[PDB]
Design a protein around this ligand. Structure first.
Ligand code: 3PE
Ligand code: 3PE
Ligand code: 3PE
Ligand code: 3PE
Ligand code: 3PE
Ligand code: 3PE
Ligand code: 3PE
Ligand code: ADP
Lengths: 42, 139, 51, 97, 459, 47, 344, 319, 54, 100
């Protein structure tokens, strides 16, 4: 009848983002593209 | 350099003027260096803004330098005991407090006091016990 | 030794253990009988005091 | 020579300050980088020449041969950059933040 | 001492190689016998400590523990057969092995001649424990608890590492035998006054002192029952064993460098004892009971009088057995109740008649009822503390009154009063639950008959 | 069986013979080295 | 890559460190460093993604200026001693240059900014080479010249690196950069004992190589550059969860595992030499490194993060196996401690 | 397995390629009698005709090949897709994401057959054409905007690496006539599907899929009548010139790397499992552990192919 | 004294001290000019460290 | 919302296996996991162990010292020597710092 609490989605969310402890500005930072390739072009 | 060293030569608690001056300089020097890294990286927006930051960091550091020097020297004077880590701790205690104020935070003053003072005290002990830092290889 | 090879694991450890602890003695046998409090002279037909 | 050897050394430091203080175009840097190799080549050749140490003249040139390719690699990276951004400003090289 | 150890290692092969259905009985039955081989060390018919070999030794202080460390592995494996019986057959064999390694490591740490062998094995025990607490911990907060348990011990540990390497250079060997028969007298400098703190602080941390004990309440709360038993019975006492063997050196400084801790502990004993008085989580109350009854020990391993030391040795072995008993019965209520709250589950004796007798005897062991080693222990620490300063009785006198109050409150609001109306009906007691208890108390009754065996090095 | 057969179903018999045979060459060199060694040690020293 | 080119490059990336190590004429040591610089740049841009060109252009400029500074030291020596190699007499500033320069190529301390960024834009594979077969070369040059370098600077770069590495790592969530940061830290310990006992530098390196090489081939087995990515390891390949746990705690100094020995003997050697100031502060923040190592432990092993439904699809398909090296380098690394005396 | 050793010593894809060797996909609405054309074209050039990707296509692909239980195959129902659109649990998105993974496996298996054997490939609808179902689903209430972004992110990450279809065929029949085609085939789930939803599917192809691919590959539009006449369509394929497209630059030393990718299924869909936690996609640790700890216990799956004795593997003690 | 004062002082403070220190040291533009200058500063200080301790 | 299992109830193992001993669900393993635990637990550790521990002879010499005292007290009293002389290490052996 017990479920050692496995982490939910929210616990997981924090580890996303390009910096763990986001700063006020560094918060704006966005995780780098998984493919290691960026969208910029012009 | 013969200068900074002078701080140590005269017995502690004596010639506070020199002590405070020397301590103030070291802090200020650190201020410049610290501001420099702070400006080189995390640059400013305008030259003036950065000149200000250099000033801010320099003064704050110079202040922590002064109060450390002044408090430790005087604490020793008033207490009459020249060799005592406690003198320095009171000094480091004060130094942290100045940092706390400049940063407008009581909390920082807390950590500042404890951490900074402890460090300074250890310096006194270090000198008293002849601890060697950055020693030459003697294996 | 079939289906009982998992019951003779721990017991075997004991034996090996005892084999080593009596081997450690063999190494630390200086002062075999050269200690001051217990330095008796060898009784007839006895090889060494403590083995 | 002792006097001159100074000028060349400060030339290398002035070239040092250059490559360690970027400003816009990279090709400037690589160009500066090369200013050092010239200063090193000149100093190595000068002392070898006034030490009459002919056994070492090979080095003044090995320095240039390696430095040339080094620069070749450097420029191919540069061409690669103004093919991906087309402006070669040290300014846009910040994706890795 | 490689029979208490090699046969132990072989347990690991048995937990893995054995059938999924028969894995539990092979492991529990065999370590019961492993405990029987452990009893041979008790045969000391002379004062000379028994130096089995260069690295492995057992003296009066270690022997009473090595036997307890070997004894609890059987019990730990019997208390965790329920939870951990819902696992995948490879999570079990990991838990069983983790428990096995703890006593392998703990048996060696308590039976180690070289102090740094203690350190390497000492700080290794965290790996098995952190896995037991974090991987199988029921609550959301065990990740946090694990962090607290690793950092408080680790930050204390690196100073000891520097200190022991330091004495090796100063004296030339970390061998407890020699260090004892050699002249190591610190010189009351400012630096030595730091060495002393470096060596004692790591031991003082895992022996919760009032200042750094927050790790233990958090750790035992979410830890599984087997981890909580290990932390209270053997893990915390690792700190005490260390303080006894390390203060052989640093002989002069503790005369005056102890006041800070002694006062921290005795005032700490009162406050830790008191907050037990109103704490809603039962596992929480037992944990603070553990802090207070261990605060007495750091105040006897510092006064350093013969009686203190064996008061300490008596209490550590005794409180170890009692605490587990309390943590084990707390779990039995937790599994049927499904909540740690003390207020729920009132009246159990009405429905679980015997477990209540075990609860009563555990509480009487918790408070100092007299024909118990628990009381002999406190009576002795109390005596020496009085010798240190007659005033100490006041503070060690507020603790006795408070200790009586919380010990009986656990019995009064958990095992008496009207029954809870209809919590999930409470299934009757398993025979395992009751034995796991009987196995804790029957040894407590037997040891109280002949206290000499657990009296320490001093006497 | 498998729709996509394993690549390992019947043993790579080379991998056995260079794995088995290699190990038996190791021992016969190792055990040889020891006894040979013991001798060199004995004669080089007193015995 | 036309397999021929692959050979030429790889040979150079391998002739590069080897010439450095074998030669004594410093010049020949410099060109060994130069080749390594030329050989690594092509591989770095193999994907040729926009991030990559940035990586190489940074790595190259940082590497090139340092290479030029190392050459200047050799050129200056040539005039202070006719020899082409550092000697007892060498002017102190001449050696300090070589320390700074070589500490840039190795990326230690206040020059630690390039490494984390190039480790972020290169593949996991070329990440390993950039971290471990490119540190051998410069370190060789330092280890050879140890008797002559300054104890003060090294220590400052050592301590700084330890701190920068640790602090940097705490915030990072990208794995490539967590490793880059760890390498900065370990590199720090290595350079701390160089002035005192070079032989231990070579142990604190090998162990780092025997620890990092398994760790990265683990990160790429599932090619996860995110902790979230490595956290779903339990579904993609469950067995590596056990050893990934021990290797990362081994990378930090926890006592039962092999990783303690490098820190333990470095501390023993520094205390033997009396740096009980420096050694203490290093060991303390070394403990910060384990915090971020264990935070990853939490996500990957001790706690099971939620996974996407398509993960079931990847399970179905046979998982291409991890090379044997993983095992042999995971065990020799996680548990050799019982054999420390012979290692040192 | 294929490796640079093999590439260095012969084994080049270039010498295994022939005119009939191309990647040809035929895409249509839910009901274009597409199946027949493909098998027909396949029969024409001996092309290995790959069937339309299915929920259990991956299970048929791996090991025994017997169909897996629904929860083992990601718990996706096309059946439930239709009867419960805009479902609370989102079976429709999970169905679409599994479908994209299945065609990713199918396309990669197809490319592996193409570069190894050299036989050309017919795979019906492709990953490139999969988007039309999602576009239509977002057009109506089936999927929400982020759901779309998550699919697009997976598509952008994995699809570019694989080379484009050589040519694409378009068997088009009008929105109304497919629904009557739907009406007579027997399943009731296919019946009662939104006419507007079918409107959005074919519109998405005409608006985006055919023009886009009209440069990347030789699109061959065919009306229903041209269809059902495999001969004619087959003729036209044999008629088009395979020139325009990225395939032109595939030198042998370039194909090798592509081959080694498709050769590794675990990578083909590496980015299909990216840790983006949208709620429908998430297994969940407790359910996922049980599903894995159950899928892994199926006979022949506990251990790697060749090593599980249950199905009759032998020689394990020497493998 | 338990909970807040003995958790804010020792266990939590050390948590914060670091957290804040990582935030400043790791908030980097990523631009090369900035980073490089810092190399300049370093060379300068080390030049001095040798100079003053000549 | 994400997919996860519905709370698993805890079974009343006492509903089937009404003789449940608490060790395992299937009955024979339970019986054989208490028939071996009460036995190896109580029957040959608490009994054989206490027997052996009780018979450890003169533990830590405290059975020897109550006789050695008796012959020392017998010998010291009859020969008139002080029962516990006041210095143990003889004063003659000690070489006290002479000046101080
Ligand atoms: C006679 C008694 C003498 C007591 C001396 C020490 C306490 C002196 C307190 C003076 C008032 C300080 C204060 O009010 O600031 C609290 C400080 C900042 O709090 P903040 O959230 O910034 O809000 C303050 C708004 N005025 O928040 C802090 O950081 C406080 C740090 C200092 C805490 C001192 C008390 C610590 C007690 C620890 C007990 C451990 C057992
Ligand atoms: C702890 C040491 C365990 C040594 C066991 C020796 C006998 C054996 O072969 O067991 C290997 C152990 C269990 O393997 P198995 O019996 O197949 O069941 C679990 C399958 N994962 O699986 C293992 O590999 C256990 C050892 C892991 C490596 C660390 C050893 C310390
Ligand atoms: C937190 C829990 C408590 C930790 C206490 C840590 C104390 C500092 C670390 C260990 C200190 C120590 O080892 O003490 C002795 C040492 C000098 O001892 P000694 O051998 O006498 O050297 C002088 C020779 N004439 O004195 C020192 O080592 C001075 C150490 C200076 C650094 C202090 C710790 C900074 C941590 C960041
Ligand atoms: C000095 C002591 C140091 C510490 C020793 C004890 C801790 C060992 C390290 C544990 C670190 C990982 C902790 C969390 C592990 C989680 C494992 C898990 O989640 O289960 C899945 C995993 C792989 O699964 P698989 O074997 O493929 O089959 C089952 C599929 N569900 O299942 C497995 O991984 C099974 C194999 C696990 C490894 C077995 C290790 C057994 C314990 C080793 C103890 C060694 C004691 C040495 C004492 C020395 C004394 C001098
Ligand atoms: C005298 C007694 C001294 C006791 C010292 C106890 C040290 C550990 C206490 C708990 C520290 C902790 O929990 O770290 C958390 C901190 C932030 O990380 P996170 O866990 O994500 O946030 C939770 C914030 N409570 O994580 C961190 O930022 C680092 C925390 C410290 C890790 C060890 C640092 C040692 C530094 C030595 C110099
Ligand atoms: C080892 C155990 C050590 C235990 C020490 C316990 C001290 C407890 C003091 C009371 C608690 C104070 C506290 O925790 O505040 C945390 C503080 C909160 O933030 P705030 O003060 O508002 O300023 C933010 C600046 N970024 O966060 C901060 O302010 C962090 C930035 C200020 C750091 C102050 C300390 C600097 C020490 C320099 C030492 C130099 C040598
Ligand atoms: C060494 C251990 C301590 C390391 C930190 C020292 C101080 C660094 C610093 O202050 O840099 C700040 C800068 C961010 O600046 P900012 O965001 O404005 O922070 C202000 C917050 N109120 O943060 C940064 O720019 C990055 C870190 C700057 C320091 C880099 C390393 C400095 C090393 C100083 C000694 C170098 C010795 C070289 C010898 C050769
Ligand atoms: N991405 C998708 N989303 C939903 N359904 C899909 C998707 N891809 C294919 N389908 C299903 O495939 C069916 C069409 O296949 P069908 O034409 O019957 O196969 P065949 O080619 O054998 O005739 C449609 O009913 C449609 O629901």
């Amino acid at each position: 009848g017990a479920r050692q609490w496995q982490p939910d989605i929210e616990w997981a969310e924090q580890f996303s983002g390009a910096v763990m402890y986001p700063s006020k500005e560094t918060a704006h930072w966005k995780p780098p593209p998984w493919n290691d390739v960026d969208i910029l072009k012009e | 350099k013969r200068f900074f060293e002078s701080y140590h030569e005269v017995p502690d608690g004596t010639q506070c003027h020199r002590k405070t001056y020397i301590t103030t300089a070291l802090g200020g020097i650190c201020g410049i260096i610290g501001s420099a890294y702070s400006v080189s990286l995390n640059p400013a927006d305008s030259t003036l803004e950065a000149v200000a930051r250099v000033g801010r960091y320099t003064f704050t550091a110079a202040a922590i330098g002064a109060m450390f020097g002044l408090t430790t020297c005087v604490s020793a004077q008033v207490r009459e005991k020249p060799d005592d880590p406690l003198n320095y701790f009171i000094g480091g205690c004060a130094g942290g407090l100045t940092l706390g104020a400049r940063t407008h935070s009581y909390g920082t003053a807390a950590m500042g006091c404890v951490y900074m003072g402890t460090a300074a005290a250890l310096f006194k002990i270090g000198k008293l016990e002849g601890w060697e830092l950055f020693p030459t290889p003697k294996v | 030794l079939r289906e009982h090879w998992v019951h003779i694991l721990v017991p075997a450890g004991f034996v090996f253990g005892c084999y080593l602890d009596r081997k450690d003695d063999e190494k630390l046998t200086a002062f075999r009988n050269k200690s001051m409090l217990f330095q008796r002279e060898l009784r007839p037909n006895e090889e060494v005091t403590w083995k | 020579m002792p006097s001159t050897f100074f000028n060349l050394t400060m030339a290398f430091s002035l070239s040092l300050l250059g490559t360690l203080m970027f400003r816009s175009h990279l090709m400037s840097t690589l160009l500066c980088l090369e200013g050092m190799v010239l200063s090193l080549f000149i100093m190595t050749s000068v002392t070898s020449l006034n030490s009459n140490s002919m056994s070492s003249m090979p080095i003044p040139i090995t320095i240039l041969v390696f430095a040339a390719c080094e620069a070749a690699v450097g420029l191919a990276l540069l061409v690669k950059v103004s093919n991906t951004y087309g402006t070669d400003y040290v300014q846009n090289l910040n994706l890795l933040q | 001492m490689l029979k208490i150890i090699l046969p132990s290692l072989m347990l690991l092969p048995l937990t893995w190689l054995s059938s999924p259905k028969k894995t539990w009985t092979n492991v529990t039955s065999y370590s019961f016998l492993i405990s029987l081989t452990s009893l041979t060390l008790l045969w000391q018919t002379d004062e000379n400590y028994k130096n089995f070999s260069n690295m492995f030794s057992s003296d009066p202080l270690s022997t009473p523990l090595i036997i307890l460390t070997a004894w609890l592995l059987p019990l730990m494996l019997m208390a965790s057969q329920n939870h951990l019986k819902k696992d995948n057959n490879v999570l079990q064999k990991l838990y069983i092995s983790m428990l096995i390694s703890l006593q392998i490591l703990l048996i060696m740490t308590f039976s180690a001649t070289e102090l740094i062998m203690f350190y390497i094995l000492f700080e290794a025990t965290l790996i098995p424990t952190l896995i037991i607490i974090t991987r199988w911990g029921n609550q959301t907060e065990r990740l946090n608890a694990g962090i607290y348990f690793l950092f408080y011990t680790l930050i204390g540990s690196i100073p000891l590492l520097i200190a022991l390497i330091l004495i090796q250079n100063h004296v030339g060997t970390l061998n407890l035998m020699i260090l004892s028969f050699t002249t190591h007298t610190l010189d009351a400098s400012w630096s030595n006054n730091l060495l002393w703190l470096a060596c004692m602080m790591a031991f003082l941390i895992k022996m919760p002192l009032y200042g750094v004990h927050l790790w233990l309440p958090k750790a035992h709360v979410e830890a599984p029952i087997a981890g909580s038993m290990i932390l209270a019975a053997i893990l915390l006492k690792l700190g005490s064993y260390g303080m006894i063997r390390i203060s052989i050196i640093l002989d002069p400084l503790t005369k005056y460098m102890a006041y800070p801790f002694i006062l921290l502990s005795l005032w700490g004993m009162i406050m830790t004892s008191s907050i037990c008085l109103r704490q809603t989580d039962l596992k929480s109350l037992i944990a603070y009971s553990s802090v207070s009854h261990m605060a007495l020990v750091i105040a006897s391993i510092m006064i350093q009088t013969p009686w203190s030391f064996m008061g300490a040795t008596m209490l550590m072995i005794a409180h170890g057995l009692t605490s587990s008993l309390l943590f084990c019965l707390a779990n039995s209520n937790y599994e049927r109740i499904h909540s740690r709250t003390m207020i729920m589950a009132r009246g159990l004796q009405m429905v679980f008649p015997l477990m209540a007798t075990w609860w009563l005897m555990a509480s009487l062991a918790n408070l100092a009822l007299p024909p118990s080693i628990n009381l002999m222990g406190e009576l002795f620490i109390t005596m020496s503390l009085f010798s240190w300063s007659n005033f100490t009785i006041i503070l060690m006198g507020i603790n006795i009154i408070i200790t009586g109050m919380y010990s009986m409150y656990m019995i009064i609001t958990t095992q008496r009063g009207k029954l809870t109306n209809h919590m999930i009906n409470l299934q009757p007691s398993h025979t395992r639950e009751l034995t796991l208890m009987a196995l804790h108390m029957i040894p407590l009754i037997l040891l109280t008959t002949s206290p000499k065996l657990i009296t320490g090095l001093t006497m | 069986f498998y729709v996509r057969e394993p690549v390992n179903a019947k043993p790579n018999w080379l991998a056995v013979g260079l794995s088995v045979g290699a190990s038996v060459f190791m021992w016969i060199y190792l055990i040889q080295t020891h006894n040979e060694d013991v001798l060199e040690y004995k004669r080089r020293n007193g015995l | 890559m036309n397999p021929i080119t692959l050979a030429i490059i790889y040979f150079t990336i391998f002739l590069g460190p080897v010439i450095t190590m074998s030669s004594t004429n410093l010049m020949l040591m410099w060109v060994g460093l130069e080749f390594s610089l030329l050989a690594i740049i092509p591989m770095l841009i193999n994907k040729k993604n926009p991030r990559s060109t940035e990586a190489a252009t940074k790595y190259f400029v940082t590497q090139a200026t340092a290479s030029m500074i190392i050459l200047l030291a050799i050129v200056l020596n040539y005039k202070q001693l006719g020899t082409w190699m550092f000697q007892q007499q060498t002017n102190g500033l001449i050696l300090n240059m070589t320390l700074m320069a070589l500490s840039m190529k190795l990326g230690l301390a206040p020059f630690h900014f390039w490494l984390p960024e190039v480790t972020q834009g290169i593949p996991l594979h070329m990440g390993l080479i950039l971290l471990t077969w490119q540190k051998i070369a410069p370190l060789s040059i330092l280890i050879q010249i140890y008797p002559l370098l300054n104890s003060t600077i090294i220590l400052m770069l050592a301590i700084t690196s330890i701190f920068m590495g640790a602090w940097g790592g705490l915030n990072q969530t990208q794995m490539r950069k967590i490793m880059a940061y760890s390498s900065i830290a370990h590199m720090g310990w290595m350079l701390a004992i160089l002035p005192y006992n070079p032989s231990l530098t070579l142990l604190n390196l090998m162990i780092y190589i025997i620890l990092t090489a398994p760790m990265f081939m683990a990160l790429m087995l599932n090619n996860s550059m995110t902790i979230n990515s490595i956290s779903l390891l339990w579904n993609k390949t469950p067995a590596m969860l056990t050893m990934i746990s021990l290797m990362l705690l081994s990378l930090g100094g926890l006592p039962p595992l092999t990783g303690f020995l490098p820190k333990w003997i470095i501390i023993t050697e520094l205390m033997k030499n009396n740096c009980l100031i420096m050694a203490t502060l290093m060991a303390m923040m070394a403990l910060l490194n384990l915090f971020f190592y264990t935070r990853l432990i939490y996500s990957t092993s001790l706690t099971m993060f939620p996974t996407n439904n398509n993960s079931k699809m990847m399970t179905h398909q046979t998982k291409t196996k991890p090379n044997l090296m993983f095992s042999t380098l995971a065990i020799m690394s996680t548990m050799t401690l019982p054999l420390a005396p012979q290692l040192i | 397995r294929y490796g640079l050793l093999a590439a260095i010593l012969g084994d080049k894809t270039t010498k295994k390629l022939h005119e009939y060797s191309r990647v040809i996909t035929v895409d249509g609405n839910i009901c274009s009698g597409k199946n027949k054309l493909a098998k027909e074209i396949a029969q024409q050039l001996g092309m290995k005709h790959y069937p339309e990707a299915g929920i259990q296509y991956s299970s048929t692909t791996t090991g025994d090949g017997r169909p897996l239980d629904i929860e083992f195959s990601g718990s996706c129902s096309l059946e439930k897709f239709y009867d419960d659109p805009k479902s609370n649990d989102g079976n429709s998105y999970r169905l679409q994401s599994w479908l994209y993974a299945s065609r990713l496996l199918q396309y990669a298996d197809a490319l592996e057959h193409l570069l190894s054997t050299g036989q050309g490939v017919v795979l019906e609808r492709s990953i490139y054409s999969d988007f039309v179902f999602l576009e239509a689903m977002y057009n109506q209430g089936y999927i929400r905007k982020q759901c779309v972004d998550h699919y697009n992110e997976i598509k952008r990450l994995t699809l570019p690496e694989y080379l484009p279809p050589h040519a694409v065929i378009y068997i088009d029949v009008p929105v109304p006539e497919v629904q009557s085609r739907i009406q007579k085939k027997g399943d009731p789930h296919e019946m009662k599907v939104t006419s507007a939803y079918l409107q959005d599917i074919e519109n998405a192809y005409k608006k985006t899929f055919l023009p886009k691919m009209s440069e990347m590959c030789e699109v061959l539009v065919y009306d229903s009548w041209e269809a059902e006449d495999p001969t004619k369509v087959v003729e036209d394929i044999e008629y088009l010139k395979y020139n325009k497209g990225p395939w032109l630059k595939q030198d042998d030393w370039t194909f090798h790397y592509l081959r080694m990718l498709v050769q590794d299924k675990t990578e083909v869909l590496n980015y299909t499992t990216i840790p983006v936690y949208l709620p429908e996609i998430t297994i969940g640790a407790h359910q996922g552990s049980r599903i894995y700890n159950s899928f892994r216990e199926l006979p022949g799956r506990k251990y790697a192919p060749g090593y599980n004795a249950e199905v009759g593997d032998k020689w394990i003690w020497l493998k | 004294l338990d909970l807040i004062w003995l958790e804010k002082t020792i266990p939590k403070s050390t948590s914060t001290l670091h957290t804040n220190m990582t935030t400043l040291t790791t908030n980097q533009k990523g631009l090369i000019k900035l980073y490089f200058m810092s190399f300049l500063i370093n060379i300068i200080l080390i030049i001095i460290l040798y100079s003053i301790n000549l | 919302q994400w997919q996860e299992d519905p709370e698993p109830e805890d079974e009343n193992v006492y509903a089937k296996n009404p003789d449940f001993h608490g060790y395992d669900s299937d009955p024979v393993v339970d019986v054989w996991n208490m028939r071996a635990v009460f036995f190896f637990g109580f029957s040959i550790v608490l009994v054989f162990g206490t027997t052996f521990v009780a018979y450890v002879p003169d533990y830590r010499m405290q059975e020897w010292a109550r006789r050695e005292a008796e012959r020392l007290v017998k010998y010291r009293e009859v020969n008139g020597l002080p029962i516990m002389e006041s210095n143990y290490f003889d004063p003659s052996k000690i070489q006290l710092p002479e000046d101080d």
